Curated annotation (Swiss-Prot), chain C:
Disulfide bonds join C7-C39, C8-C41, C13-C23, C204-C216. This is Spike glycoprotein E1. Signal peptide: none annotated. N-glycosylated. Class II viral fusion protein. Fusion activity is inactive as long as E1 is bound to E2 in mature virion. After virus attachment to target cell via host MXRA8 and endocytosis, acidification of the endosome induce dissociation of E1/E2 heterodimer and concomitant trimerization of the E1 subunits. This E1 trimer is fusion active, and promotes release of viral nucleocapsid in cytoplasm after endosome and viral membrane fusion. Efficient fusion requires the presence of cholesterol and sphingolipid in the target membrane. Residues 29-46 are annotated as: E1 fusion peptide loop. It is found in: Virion membrane; Host cell membrane. The chain holds residues 862 to 1078 of 1242 of the full protein. The precursor of protein E3/E2 and E1 form a heterodimer shortly after synthesis. Processing of the precursor of protein E3/E2 into E2 and E3 results in a heterodimer of the spike glycoproteins E2 and E1. Spike at virion surface are constituted of a trimer of E2-E1 heterodimers. After target cell attachment and endocytosis, E1 change conformation to form homotrimers. Interacts with 6K protein. It comes from Mayaro virus (strain Brazil) (MAYV). Glycans are attached at N86, N215. It is a single-pass type I membrane protein.
Length: 380, 340, 217
């Protein structure tokens, strides 16, 4: 009715499953997985764009003292260099000898390239393994995709799939993950907006489309050179370029669990790790009734060709001189070996891809409710 | 036709529908069919689907006096004012857009619609629909004129009908009643009338021609002749009872008037309370109101919390622990107190 | 819809595409209307009737959501009276979003207290909170909280197991009887549980534009 089992979550491994129902045939389930990425829940706290200071026109009290209005920008700073020299090449901008002053102001802003491309950094919560299991359950043959939490159950064609709740969040999620340029990297985000200058995140982003812009950029004006208006201004180094260039190894490389860390949504697709358990309420039609089954007999298993270190491996010649003809499920009751399929023809000297990575092969084949022990030695 | 909505309404011929029960046993393809009565609102409004396209005249004019119902002939015109809805008493009608009527009625188990258009004395059906009085609020009183509250509540918003979601029309129907074709002593004859009798018999006059005129086929008896029903300028409402008398379906859009809007409501708050202090305990002496569920939670740890539909003068033993309890007894604010 | 009635004449049985789109052709129709000939065969007619389970139209107006939940973060405005400074400053108390007071470097926590009224998978219905067992995501049992599950709130597919069962009607009228199950969405709205604000330990008023319990004691 409902058979529970597990397939090892490594993409491609055909996980056979003998199903047992009284008066049905031997049920054959073949599970296959592809692309079960985890997708951890994130929450951004930064944008990491290039902070660009704007130095306005110099208020040249030429002569006279100047004023200094309060700016509103994050890198807003003003200064009044007393005693400017107006000797500009397109005309003396100061028309008096001395007592002038230069009001120089600049305001730091997030650059226009940020809307083109930014650098996000999210704190990380858990995620859900998303897989496509090809189920070959008898005449049923389909491939169902589901999150591994179990709650969104798989409505198979008569099949009730409950794949998971998952076993272990061994995943590439750190406490904080920066997606920068599409690449993923674990890196310690600073304090939220109030980070130190010269760091990866000197312009702090409360929201990536946020209206305020947190900063710790070290702006500092300079008393410029006389004659014309030069506005010397010492900001910090370009830490966004200092963080973008001069980045570390991206977490998409060096991913444990063999995952491909692909992040439109940040998910470790094909994370080869663990075994996914699945429970399956089998369809009542799936029990091909044993009274109509191919009447089997004379099970003689011969171990023909053994490569004990091969993918294909087993060339097993099972002889079955059965009474009634029909398709035979070849689902073995042996865990040290793996069969090519469960499709066995009219009984005879049928070959089979009996793959087994074990050196000393001995397998309990299950052919139509007949089961035998094929023993042999593989090749290295 | 949206402002005068009878343009879009009368693009479909608003025709009658098969009610099974209209007065202790009888129900035919009358205007007394209630197709569907839906009330998606916290304001307590019933939006019923009525069989005729009430409001459109014989020309489908925007007629305040109009109630476009059906007869054997399509134009079963009736007074727009003469229509009556009664849940347990006469529920207050709000408006009508074609087949969609909207009103407000008291609590009841069914809604009865009665209208007399040319007929004797208010042809009326009565659909079973257990209309509840499900209102929100700390109390449970149906009195709008309390100067006490303002809470959010949904309703079938009473805006002018163009559409928010349209019902689909289709299938100019064929009726199941063939008394049009008759026999004159050897000859079938199909006259013309408000039922489009397609000649549908074994051979002869029952071979062609919708009943817009007379066709004769001699050698005709009661058996070998056949009527059929055809239509024009319309598609059926839903064919809910409505035997699908078309060969294929082809929808038209009728914008379901009275699209739902979220509004506010006024809920009355009862007399507030009396608190009697004690050693860790308080007596909430409440004289009753129009009865309402008052709830007292215990703010802090694994909170002792209860709620009871107060409907009499009593005293709640609010346990007033060291952390304090939170007692919201009625439609007041949720304020709970501390020790003493 | 209006049933495909062959009067007389048997029909075929074409299947719709709805989630509750089930069809069935009963035999032995005998229509007795008043608008043209439809019950014109003495027998052999067939009434094919199909129902289609569609989502309620008021859902875009108002649905009843149910979300699972990971942990959340306390967020507070602290009035700080640091001598001549006397201001109020808001901040997430998770410990990252450090507040820059006027010469003050405020850091709030992060306090490790998951005594929070977030359940495992709580449902928000009209603003009401209720932690409870969400059904199978699409695999719900008919006649309960979640007779028609929502993969997405305006989601394209519709997952439900509502108990519609068609029945052959009686003569004369086109009574396409379809025994539907009870309305579980009404049966989950009516027969509602205690509120999320009801029985809130720590007394925090659960308010959900975003679902957060303000005033955490």
């Amino acid at each position: 009715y409902e058979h529970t089992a597990i397939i090892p979550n490594q993409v491609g491994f055909p996980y056979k499953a003998h199903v047992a129902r009284e008066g049905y045939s031997p049920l054959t389930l073949q599970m296959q997985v592809i692309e079960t990425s985890l997708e951890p829940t994130l929450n951004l706290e930064y944008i990491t764009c290039d902070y660009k200071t704007k130095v306005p026109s110099p208020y040249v009290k030429c002569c006279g003292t100047a004023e200094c209005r309060t700016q509103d920008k994050p890198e807003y700073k003003c200064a009044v260099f007393t005693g400017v020299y107006p000797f500009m090449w397109g005309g003396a901008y100061c028309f008096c000898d001395s007592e002038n002053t230069q009001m120089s102001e600049a305001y730091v802003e997030r650059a226009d390239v940020c809307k083109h491309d930014h650098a996000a950094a999210y704190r990380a919560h858990t995620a859900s393994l998303r897989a496509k299991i090809k189920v070959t359950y008898g005449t049923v043959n389909q491939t169902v995709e589901a999150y591994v939490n179990g709650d969104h159950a798989v409505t198979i064609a008569g099949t009730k799939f409950i794949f998971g709740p998952v076993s272990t969040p061994w995943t590439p999620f750190d406490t904080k993950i920066l997606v920068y340029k599409g690449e993923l990297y674990n890196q310690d985000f600073p304090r939220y907006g109030a980070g130190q200058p010269g760091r990866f995140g000197d312009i702090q982003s409360r929201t990536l489309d946020s209206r305020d812009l947190y900063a710790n950029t070290g702006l500092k004006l300079a008393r410029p050179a006389a004659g014309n208006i030069h506005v010397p201004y010492t900001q910090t180094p370009s830490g966004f370029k200092t963080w973008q260039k001069d980045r570390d190894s991206p977490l998409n490389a060096k991913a444990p669990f063999g995952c491909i860390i692909q992040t439109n949504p940040v998910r470790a697709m094909n994370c080869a790790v663990g075994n996914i358990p699945v429970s399956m309420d089998i369809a009542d039609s799936a029990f091909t009734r044993l009274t109509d089954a191919p009447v089997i007999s004379e099970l003689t298993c011969t171990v023909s060709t053994c490569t004990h270190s091969s993918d294909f491996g087993g060339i097993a010649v099972l002889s079955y001189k059965v009474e009634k003809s029909g398709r035979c499920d070849i689902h073995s009751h042996s865990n040290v070996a793996v069969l090519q399929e469960v499709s066995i023809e009219t009984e005879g000297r049928s070959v089979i891809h009996f793959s087994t990575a074990s050196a000393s092969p001995s397998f309990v084949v299950s052919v139509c409710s007949s089961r035998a022990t094929c023993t042999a030695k593989c090749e290295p | 036709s949206t402002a005068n909505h009878f343009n879009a309404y009368k693009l479909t011929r608003p025709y009658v529908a098969y009610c099974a029960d209209c007065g202790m046993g009888h129900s035919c393809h009358s205007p007394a069919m209630i197709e569907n009565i839906q009330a998606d609102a916290t304001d307590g409004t019933l939006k019923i689907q009525f069989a005729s396209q009430i409001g459109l005249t014989k020309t489908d004019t925007h007629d305040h006096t109009k109630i476009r119902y059906a007869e054997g002939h399509d134009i079963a015109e009736a007074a727009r004012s003469t229509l009556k809805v009664h849940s347990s008493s006469e529920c207050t009608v709000t408006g009508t857009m074609g087949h969609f009527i909207l009103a407000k009625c008291p609590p009841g188990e069914r809604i009865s619609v009665s209208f007399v258009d040319s007929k004797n004395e208010h042809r009326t059906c009565r659909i079973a629909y257990h209309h509840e009085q499900r209102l929100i609020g700390r109390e449970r009183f149906t009195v709008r004129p309390h100067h006490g509250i303002e809470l959010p509540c949904t309703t079938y918003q009473l805006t002018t009908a163009e559409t928010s979601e349209e019902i689909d029309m289709h299938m100019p129907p064929d009726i199941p009643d063939r008394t049009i074709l008759s026999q004159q002593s050897g000859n079938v004859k199909i006259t013309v009338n408000g039922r489009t009798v397609r000649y549908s018999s074994s051979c002869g006059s029952q071979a062609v021609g919708t009943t817009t005129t007379d066709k004769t086929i001699n050698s005709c008896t009661v058996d070998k002749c056949q009527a059929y029903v055809t239509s024009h300028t319309k598609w059926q409402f839903n064919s809910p009872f409505v035997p699908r008398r078309m060969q294929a379906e082809r929808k038209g859009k009728v914008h379901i008037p009275f699209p739902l809007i979220n509004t506010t409501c006024r809920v009355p708050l009862a007399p507030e309370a009396l608190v009697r202090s004690g050693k860790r305990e308080a007596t909430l002496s409440l004289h009753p109101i129009h009865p309402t569920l008052l709830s007292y939670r215990t703010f802090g740890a694994e909170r002792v919390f209860d709620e009871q539909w107060i409907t009499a003068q009593t005293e709640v033993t609010i346990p007033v622990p060291v952390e304090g309890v939170e007692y919201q007894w009625g439609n007041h604010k949720p304020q709970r107190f501390v020790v003493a």
